[PDB]
Design a protein around this ligand. Structure first.
Ligand SMILES: [Mg+2]
Ligand SMILES: [Mg+2]
Lengths: 336, 333
DNA sequence: AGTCCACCGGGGGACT
DNA sequence: AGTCCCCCGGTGGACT
């Protein structure tokens, strides 16, 4: 659970355990002795807590101590089971830690859009925990899907064909000169629910916790929307980075521009909203870095920033609160 | 020495040791038990050798193995003086080795600029070791300088005043927002007239002695303020190994440079390139075929010119020469 | 001392 | 099984 419980651990099928001994099952070319079963840890640690949507105690806990819980728990399991034999490298901890921050944050945002899509339809503003109800004119036409995007995704895949053609048009004209414009992906993407999903349930149900089934619901959500999004319906991109290093600022910042250049540039979409979330900015450097303007629109168009802001959630609750407010505000020029 | 010498390691003061004990001299908020004197690893391992400029054994040795040596040596030294206890975290190495690759590869391009400048200036074309003499018609005006840029650098600081200025008339009608500049791992700038007769730009160097480390790391200052827009000839970014996400800083910087120099100071396209010894997944190459974003509003070329993978210190050196040999043509004799 | 910078390799899971 | 994708935190040194 969210607090290590040797009883819950004792009822774990050996293959649901958080640590995995592999001193007999060596990995190809890898010295790894014990694996961090990140999926497992998630379901153990967050089986029924979805931070921001749980106990007040939890919701306002320092968000770092929350995101860092799953690791703590697993290290305890290891020690308990293996003791001294136990050893895992910093880089495992960083790998998993960084993933968990991305997954859990998205889970929060998932629930945020549940509640949001409920109300948005003909539901109310669910009671608990208490968050300020939005003000905006409700409308089914104003629900949104929250797509935690997967490794080596291509954001362009979300778009409707007519828009994918414009682009592969463009690129072909580039390709005719030894020139490419590869597109990658943000860590997550909030889209406007395509019409024909506006009546579907799933986009309205808050989840109790990140159990395996529940994890999967989220990590796959994107598959449903591929080919169904309109250029202007990409309405928020987020990049997740637990801690910062001056060199690790550049993926979101570059892609952002590429998205702007295509969406805004070649498909006349409104300014593209792309932000970055971190729990550790290590100076001011990071902040000034993301004050950078958007490079396409520096050669008749209005100037705006590539990244709209750099955000550092204190609590899972603030994250909720922050996103509700964005939705309330951004879902305005959306005639419902 | 490039080969781990016991005797030498013993003949070593302790302020010289490649491995530092600090178990009783900790770092605020750090579990670091043993530090890596990476300046004492250059020194020890490369104090006599500058790859591609030493014996043929080195010059053509697998270049990964060369960069990998200081750290090999270090870990031997550590295991002799601290048999039970010697331990360092993966990430300590990853830092040191990354930097060494930046420094030494800069230290190879330095001796290149050296011997090339000599040629240009009317001295010989030295030939220890032999490299094909360049067919460019020499000139003191086609000398180049190889700046190993420091952490925190801003490459604009290299530009001359009237140029930095215009990067303000534009930049100032542009602020809640802005457009910062960072730095390539290294720059190659045309030597500026005022310096074309100094002798420091022509002396090659024997090893990476602290004195010598320091001369190459200091070099940039000498050129702050004194460089034309089109005289920025080449930018390199050193990444010893690649990870798909670790690809974007040279890509962005390049765009920004290209943006200002090319579109705002009407300079020639800018040559920006990456050197790595380990691309692992070949995402990278396709990644570095990206059109320059600036240019997609005007009329076009790659942002990053190429992604390069040196086999040997020698390959590195021959490549840079041909670059010069084909690029300085533009400079007027 | 304390603060900032930019190095990169060991990773768990998707996918084949 | 093999390969690839994107995670980040622990660092050695320049400054102040
Ligand atoms: Mg991320
Ligand atoms: Mg580099």
């Amino acid at each position: 659970p969210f607090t290590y419980s040797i009883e819950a651990t004792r009822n774990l099928a050996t293959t649901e355990r958080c640590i995995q001994d592999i001193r007999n099952a060596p990995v190809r070319n890898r010295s790894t002795q014990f694996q961090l079963a990140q999926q497992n840890m998630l379901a153990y640690t967050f089986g029924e807590v979805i931070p921001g949507f749980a106990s007040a105690g939890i919701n306002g806990m320092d968000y770092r101590d929350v995101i860092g819980r799953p690791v703590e728990n697993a290290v305890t399991e290891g020690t308990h089971f293996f003791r001294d034999d136990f050893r895992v490298d910093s880089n495992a901890k960083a790998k998993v830690a960084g993933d968990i921050f991305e997954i859990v944050s998205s889970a929060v945002m998932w629930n945020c859009a549940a509640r949001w899509n409920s109300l948005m339809v003909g539901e109310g503003w669910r009671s608990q925990p208490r968050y300020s109800r939005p003000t905006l004119s409700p409308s089914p036409r104003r629900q949104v899907a929250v797509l935690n995007l997967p490794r080596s995704f291509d954001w362009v895949s979300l778009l409707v064909p007519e828009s994918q053609e414009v682009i592969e048009e463009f690129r072909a004209g580039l390709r005719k000169d030894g020139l490419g414009l590869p597109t990658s992906t943000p860590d997550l993407a909030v889209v406007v629910l395509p019409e024909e999903f506006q009546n579907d349930e799933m986009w309205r149900e808050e989840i109790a916790g990140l159990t395996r089934p529940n994890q999967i619901l989220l990590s796959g959500a994107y598959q449903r929307l591929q080919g169904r999004v309109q250029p202007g319906e990409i309405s928020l991109a987020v990049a997740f980075k637990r801690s910062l290093r001056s060199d690790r600022l550049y993926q979101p910042l570059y892609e952002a521009n590429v998205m702007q250049l295509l969406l805004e540039g070649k498909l006349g979409a409104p300014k593209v909203e792309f932000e970055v979330h971190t729990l550790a900015p290590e100076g001011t450097n990071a902040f000034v870095t993301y004050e950078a303007a958007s490079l396409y629109g520096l050669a008749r168009s209005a100037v705006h920033r590539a990244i709209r802001e750099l955000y550092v959630p204190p609590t899972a609750a603030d994250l909720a609160r922050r996103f509700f407010a964005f939705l309330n505000e951004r879902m305005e020029l959306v005639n419902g």
